[PDB]
Every structure is written in structure tokens, then in C-alpha cells.
Amino acid sequence: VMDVMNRLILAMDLMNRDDALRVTGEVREYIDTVKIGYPLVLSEGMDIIAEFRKRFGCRIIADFKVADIPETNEKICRATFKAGADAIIVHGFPGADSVRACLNVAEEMGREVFLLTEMSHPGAEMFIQGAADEIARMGVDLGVKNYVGPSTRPERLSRLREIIGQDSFLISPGAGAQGGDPGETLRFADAIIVGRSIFLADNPAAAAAGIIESIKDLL
Amino acid sequence: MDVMNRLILAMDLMNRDDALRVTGEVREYIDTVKIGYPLVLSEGMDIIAEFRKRFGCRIIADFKVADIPETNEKICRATFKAGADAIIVHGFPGADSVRACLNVAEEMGREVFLLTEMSHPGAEMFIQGAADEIARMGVDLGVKNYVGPSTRPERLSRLREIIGQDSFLISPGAGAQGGDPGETLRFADAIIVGRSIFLADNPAAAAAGIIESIKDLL
Ligand SMILES: O=c1cc(O)n([C@@H]2O[C@H](COP(=O)(O)O)[C@@H](O)[C@H]2O)c(=O)[nH]1
Ligand SMILES: O=c1cc(O)n([C@@H]2O[C@H](COP(=O)(O)O)[C@@H](O)[C@H]2O)c(=O)[nH]1
């Protein structure tokens, strides 16, 4: 599994290249893994991955929540890995063929797939939550090794950890701005994803350092 | 939305030169292009403005938006800034995620299309069982534009029943995935067609042929 420094992944969802680069640079001593999603990519282009690699050397998880038919999923994964992403996040709710398409490209290209199981926001309760245990079980059956589950629902995160086993890698968004607790979340997740409570802080480095201090016994 | 010939081109070629050339070859037949991540991630969001400059076609950004509300708002803002007229949003992540997109679309003078059931086999696993409820949710939220599957006309018909005849319904899966254009247009206002056109030996002839096969429906 990837070795995530300080069990902390920055969600870099600022949409301005200069701000995104500044903040990431300021927290680089604390974090060696950055999640780049569509807010930044659709604003600044896929080259932003290259620019982060050039500037920081951080691992890059492309949070693209891939959610199309197998044919299109393959093309998205190819484009994303060609651009230099280490890993891509894929939705499980569109089913096994759609996930398999992503796994096939990742295998061919020597990269990683993360399977998003349950989501952290309130709306996740409407449809995703009821499917999430089965989505995780499907992931295990397909050979998925990396997963995403919600900090906002520790009870659900705990169940998802059980399903995927202790050897699987699990990352978790929702701590901070969405109300999740870093320490509680790290009982189950290998690493926490944190966005706004770092990148909107007056001092993002201090914010990251503070989170790390609060979980220091867990490192 | 008024779609010429009830035919929306899914431009999923990844090379700018090829995408522009093939679109140009079929431009007389369409006035609506669906641009997705295969093209956008290969050539950048500037491709949308380029299509508008060259073709003056309407642009549907097929981004299958499927994040939390905060992120969905950012995605929609970036997408509409690039000149998309509409965006396709998944319903499976729930009402708040859809509402986030509706809010931005209203602010920027654009449309949201709600994807209910998908066309591929894996849609049967989780999406199909939720799809009627996703459609009802769309109705409750005031969604007027929907996407459902050419590959399952009984499901497409049910989706039409739920949303009513006043709603606008577009449908992928005709051609390459096995759907039939004419049958699909019994229920959908327009069909989305990708590979059957853009991978054809002669894309213009492929488009012309499809339109000929549905001429009585135009
Ligand atoms: O269930 C999920 C899955 C996610 O990827 N995310 C992502 O994780 C990040 C959370 O950021 P924040 O710490 O600002 O709430 C965002 O990039 C969001 O898109 C999430 O919030 N919930
Ligand atoms: O359920 C759906 C929803 C889609 O947007 N699509 C999209 O519609 C297009 C179908 O292309 P094609 O005609 O080559 O099968 C692709 O861009 C695909 O991503 C789909 O196939 N099924």
C-alpha cells in the first residue's frame, strides 16, 4: 500500500492555480499525498497534475469519481494515468463491469484504483448507504485493494473496514468541515482526507500541523 | 431544448483534430454535441469554446456529476464557465447533490440533466432498483431534463411515465450498445449516438443513415 505521510491526504479543491500551488507548497513538509479533483482540474487543466509533480513530488490521487459505462470509464482512466496520476477514485454504484474496466486499465498502466463505497454527505443516505456493504463486497470479489468511506459515519466506516479486511487500504473524507473527527476516523481508516479545514485556514501549515498534533499517538 | 433531427452526437474521440474533423463532417445533421471526459481530459476545457466558435452547436457536458454538494457546485461552476449549456448529473448520490447543481445552473443560465438509469449491464446491479425513485426525486426537485437507457426501452418507457410528456428525455445506448433508434424515440425526445457515427467508415453517411431510419419520427 502507498505510504501516506502522517496519515493525512490534502484535498486540494481550490480552483485557482496560484492559490492551489501556494497552499500545497506551504503544507508539503507535512503531507506527501495530494488528492486533486475536478474543481481544480476543470479550472486549470490536466497539466496541473504535472505541475504538482514538478513542484512538490507528492503522490497524486485523481478524485474523478468515475461513474460511466465500461467503455467511457476505460478512456477516462487512460487519460488520467497518461497525465501522471498515481491513482484514480471510481464509484462502485454503477456496478462490477464499470469497476472492472477501471481495474483493467490500472493494471495495464501500473497504477491504482480506489473504490468509493459510501459517501460522507447527507444525501448518501438516500441510495448509496443501502448499497454500500454490497459495493464493498463486490470490490473485494473484484480484487480491489484500496477504498474510500465516510468519516461522518464512524459506524458505517467500521463496517466497511470489516468487509474489506485489515489488509485493504482505506482513506476517508469528512473530517473537519463536514463534522467528522480525525482521531475517531483513524481507528478504521489508514488515512484521512482533509480539504477546507486546511486550505481555507489563515495558515494552512498551522492547520495541518494542528491536525497532526491531535493524532500524534496514532502515527 | 430543441434538438435538430432528435440526434445528439456523443463526441468521445480523444484527439482534438479528429474530434473537430468528424464533428465538422456531420454538422449539417446536428445542432447539439455531448462532450464528456474522454475529450475534455485529453484536450482541456477550452475544447468547449472551440466547438462553439466552429459550429455554434449547443454543448451538453456529460460529466456524470457524482460528488458531495460542495464539490458539485464547484464542478458546475467550472463547467459553465467553460461555456457548456447543460450538465449531466447522477441522481444516485441523492437530493442534496442534485440541488447543488440545480442552484448553479439557475445562476448561470444553464440546464441540468438528471441521469436516472444507465444503459450498460452493470446498471442492473444497483442503479436500476433505485431508478424510479431517482426519477420521482427529480420530479420533486423540479428537474425538467432526464437521461435514460436506449438498451432497455421498457425502463425508458417507465421513466417517461414518471416524468411526464412535458419533461425532456435523452437516451444513450442506440447503435454500439444494441439499442434501436426508432424504438428509443417512442419514449425519448432525442437519442445520443457516439461510436456508430464517429467510428464509422463515413461518419456523415452513418449520421444520414440513422436520420433516414427515423425520418417518419421527425
Ligand atoms: O464521500 C465523499 C467522497 C469524497 O471524495 N469527498 C471529497 O473529499 C473532499 C472533502 O473536503 P473537505 O475536507 O473540504 O470536506 C472533497 O474533495 C470531496 O469531494 C467527500 O467529501 N466525501
Ligand atoms: O447510461 C448511459 C449514460 C451515458 O451518458 N452514456 C454515454 O453516452 C455515450 C454512448 O456512446 P455510444 O453511442 O458510442 O455507445 C457515451 O459518451 C457514454 O458515456 C451511456 O452510454 N450510457
Side-chain angles (χ1 to χ4, degrees), chain A residues 13 65 67-68 75 94 121 123, chain B residues 12 64 67 74 90 93 120:
Chain A
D13 297 313
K65 293 189 182 56
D68 219 300
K75 292 188 169 184
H121 65 297
Chain B
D12 296 315
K64 302 286 189 311
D67 219 302
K74 291 188 170 180
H90 264 293
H120 65 299

Side-chain angles (χ1 to χ4, degrees), chain A residues 38 41-43 45-47 76 79, chain B residues 11-15 19 34-49 51 59-63 79 82 84:
Chain A
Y38 282 136
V41 161
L42 299 183
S43 296
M46 287 293 275
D47 283 345
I76 291 168
Chain B
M11 182 36 64
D12 296 315
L13 292 173
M14 304 175 74
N15 173 279
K34 183 176 78 63
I35 293 178
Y37 283 137
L39 179 54
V40 160
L41 299 183
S42 295
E43 297 287 358
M45 287 291 276
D46 293 335
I47 197 66
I48 295 176
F51 271 59
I59 300 296
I60 299 169
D62 178 12
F63 290 174
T79 298

Side-chain angles (χ1 to χ4, degrees), chain A residues 132-150:
Chain A
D133 284 6
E134 186 175 352
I135 290 171
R137 190 165 77 252
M138 173 192 74
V140 173
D141 192 48
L142 292 176
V144 174
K145 297 171 302 175
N146 309 290
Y147 297 82
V148 188

Side-chain angles (χ1 to χ4, degrees), chain A residues 11 13 35 63 65 119-120 173 175 178 194-196, chain B residues 67-68 71:
Chain A
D13 297 313
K35 187 177 78 61
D63 183 8
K65 293 189 182 56
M119 287 181 74
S120 63
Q178 295 177 62
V194 180
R196 285 165 287 174
Chain B
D67 219 302
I68 68 170
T71 299

Side-chain angles (χ1 to χ4, degrees), chain A residues 111-137:
Chain A
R111 304 291 165 82
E112 301 210 89
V113 166
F114 279 68
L115 183 66
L116 175 57
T117 60
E118 185 167 328
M119 287 181 74
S120 63
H121 65 297
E125 290 177 358
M126 292 193 68
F127 305 112
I128 290 170
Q129 180 171 86
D133 284 6
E134 186 175 352
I135 290 171
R137 190 165 77 252

Side-chain angles (χ1 to χ4, degrees), chain A residues 1-9 114 145-149 157 161 164-172 182 184-193 215 218-219:
Chain A
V1 302
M2 58 172 59
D3 181 7
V4 174
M5 190 169 166
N6 290 318
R7 304 181 71 182
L8 177 64
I9 298 169
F114 279 68
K145 297 171 302 175
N146 309 290
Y147 297 82
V148 188
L157 191 64
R161 165 59 76 186
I164 67 180
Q166 305 305 313
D167 291 339
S168 294
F169 191 68
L170 176 59
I171 67 181
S172 181
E184 288 175 24
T185 302
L186 291 174
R187 288 182 298 166
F188 310 113
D190 296 282
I192 50 174
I193 292 160
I215 62 167
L218 308 178
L219 302 175

